Amino acid sequence: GPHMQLTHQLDLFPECRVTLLLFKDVKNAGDLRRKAMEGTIDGSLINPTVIVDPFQILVAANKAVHLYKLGKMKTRTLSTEIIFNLSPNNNISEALKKFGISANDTSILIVYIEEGEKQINQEYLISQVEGHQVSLKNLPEIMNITEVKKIYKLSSQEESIGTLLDAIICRMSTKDVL
Amino acid sequence: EPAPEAEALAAARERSSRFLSGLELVKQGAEARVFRGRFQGRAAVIKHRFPKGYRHPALEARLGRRRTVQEARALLRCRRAGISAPVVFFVDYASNCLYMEEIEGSVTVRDYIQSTMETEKTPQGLSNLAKTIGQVLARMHDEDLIHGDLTTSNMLLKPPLEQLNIVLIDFGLSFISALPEDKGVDLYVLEKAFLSTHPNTETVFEAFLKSYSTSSKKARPVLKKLDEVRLR
Numbered sequence: 001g002p003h004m005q006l007t008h009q010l011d012l013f014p015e016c017r018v019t020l021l022l023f024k025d026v027k028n029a030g031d032l033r034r035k036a037m038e039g040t041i042d043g044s045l046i047n048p049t050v051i052v053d054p055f056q057i058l059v060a061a062n063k064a065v066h067l068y069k070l071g072k073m074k075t076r077t078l079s080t081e082i083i084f085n086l087s088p089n090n091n092i093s094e095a096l097k098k099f100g101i102s103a104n105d106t107s108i109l110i111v112y113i114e115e116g117e118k119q120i121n122q123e124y125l126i127s128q129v130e131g132h133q134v135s136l137k138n139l140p141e142i143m144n145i146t147e148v149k150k151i152y153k154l155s156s157q158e159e160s161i162g163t164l165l166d167a168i169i170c171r172m173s174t175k176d177v178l
Numbered sequence: 179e180p181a182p183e184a185e186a187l188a189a190a191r192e193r194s195s196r197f198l199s200g201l202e203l204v205k206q207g208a209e210a211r212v213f214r215g216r217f218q219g220r221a222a223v224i225k226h227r228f229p230k231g232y233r234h235p236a237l238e239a240r241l242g243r244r245r246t247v248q249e250a251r252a253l254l255r256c257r258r259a260g261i262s263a264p265v266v267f268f269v270d271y272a273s274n275c276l277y278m279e280e281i282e283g284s285v286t287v288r289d290y291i292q293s294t295m296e297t298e299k300t301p302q303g304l305s306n307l308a309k310t311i312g313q314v315l316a317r318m319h320d321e322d323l324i325h326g327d328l329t330t331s332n333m334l335l336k337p338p339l340e341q342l343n344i345v346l347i348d349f350g351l352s353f354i355s356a357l358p359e360d361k362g363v364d365l366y367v368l369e370k371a372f373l374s375t376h377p378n379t380e381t382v383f384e385a386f387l388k389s390y391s392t393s394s395k396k397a398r399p400v401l402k403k404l405d406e407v408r409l410r
């Protein structure tokens with residue numbers, strides 16, 4: 001029944017597992033955003049319309065765990081750090097608005113990380129979303145290429161030598177040294 | 179008693195050297211080593227400079243940080259300018275390790291040339307390769323990116339080989355400069371590599387220069403500085 005989640009171990013942090021859950025037709029995104037701010041929902045609530053591939057999330061999560069174990073995160077929590085890492089810029093407040101969720105949203109990607117005794121009650125989490133969980137194969141129907149290209153300011157030079165994903169990844173992975 | 183921040187930093191460096199542990203070596207330079215691995219489902223290479231046993235540990239860390247940072251900036255600059263080079267996945271500044279896309283199945287330009295020289299007996303059929311490298315380095319210099327170490331070992335041909343898909347690598351010595359002298363020295367390093375690693379390919383380097391000159395509108399002062407730095 002529930003087997004729609006996508007889970008990967010972090011190669012560099014073998015004890016850590018990243019989980020992705022995707023939902024359509026969400027009716028309570030306002031509640032979910034308030035709950036994330038009150039710490040009563042686990043995970044990063046991410047806007048899936050600007051996520052082109054799970055690899056994008058896994059790169060963001062790898063970096064967030066890394067800084068998090070160093071005590072050198074740019075934001076206040078692991079969940080906000082994953083979201084901030086998706087953005088092409090170092091503006092924290094801008095990243096959390098464009099890549100996080102609003103009450104205006106009806107699709108949501110929840111990302112969370114488990115390690116050791118830090119475990120998420122996945123059934124309880126899914127029960128909090130007033131919406132329909134779907135397999136991540138559905139992500140191309142939700143992602144909006146126009147919106148992605150605007151956020152990341154991808155140009156035609158970039159597109160001439162690889163994929164939009166590769167240009168996005170390159171932006172994400174080097175923005176800390178501008 | 180130890181500072182938690184220092185402990186966490188040592189645990190990250192231990193994680194890094196554990197990841198590198200069983201990996202195969204695919205390239206080696208004076209300071210750096212490049213290993214082949216996997217990063218979150220993608221073929222990756224990981225580049226690291228191991229501390230040399232005769233240097234102060236803090237000098238080694240400074241060197242590793244400076245070159246890692248410069249290479250990550252250069253690779254971003256390449257991607258945004260449409261210059262083909264590896265995608266950066268992750269840069270670990272705790273251990274100064276750079277995780278990059280593996281250019282799978284590629285051969286270095288060095289090996290491609292020497293192979294052609296041994297099968298053919300003449301550099302005749304390397305003209306298109308020379309013209310392509312001319313176009314690529316022209317674009318790189320027009321972005322004011324000085325590679326710093328242009329040899330035929332730092333250019334890859336991504337398969338299918340005969341498409342001549344050049345991918346530039348190893349920007350650990352790169353920097354940003356608009357000065358024709360810096361671009362001239364860059365070219366001179368490459369000239370010397372050609373002359374000494376591929377003897378009797380002067381016509382190949384000649385076609386490279388002709389292609390460079392028509393590809394960049396700023397080549398004229400650069401080629402004048404090439405003439406000057408060779409003399410000095």
Ligand SMILES: Nc1ccc2c(c1)C(=O)N([C@@H]1CCC(=O)NC1=O)C2=O
Pocket residue numbers: 204205212214223225264278279280281282283284285334347348
């Ligand atoms: N700085 C570098 C960036 C990327 C690469 C290298 C160095 C490098 O030595 N290689 C080889 C090329 C040949 C092959 O098939 N796999 C590799 O791993 C890379 O792909």
